Amino acid sequence: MALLGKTLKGRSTRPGGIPQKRNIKWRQLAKNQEEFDQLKQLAKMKREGLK
């Protein structure tokens, strides 16, 4: 149930230098949903003005 070797791994991607950044964007979720819940609704009522 374990003597299988069908899987073949991918390549050996070379990429080099520039590393990860610091902790910057942790508190930016203040208005993530609200804007999506607001910007969408701000003009989502623009259709009963049609029928």
Partner: protein, 53 residues
């Protein structure tokens, strides 16, 4: 010609029921429901197609 006390001091009724239900209106603010908005999107697109034909 004639004088002078035809006018009198009659007072009318104190019926003040003109404020029957002005304040009784439910205090629900303009809470824009999302379902209505997609529904009207659909309806408006339908009538735009209707305009087309």
């Amino acid at each position: 010609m004639s004088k002078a006390a035809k006018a009198k001091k009659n007072v009318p009724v104190v019926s003040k029921l003109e404020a029957d239900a002005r304040k009784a209106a439910e205090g629900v603010n303009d809470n824009e429901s999302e379902e209505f908005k997609k529904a009207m999107r659909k309806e408006a697109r339908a009538l735009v197609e209707q305009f087309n034909e």
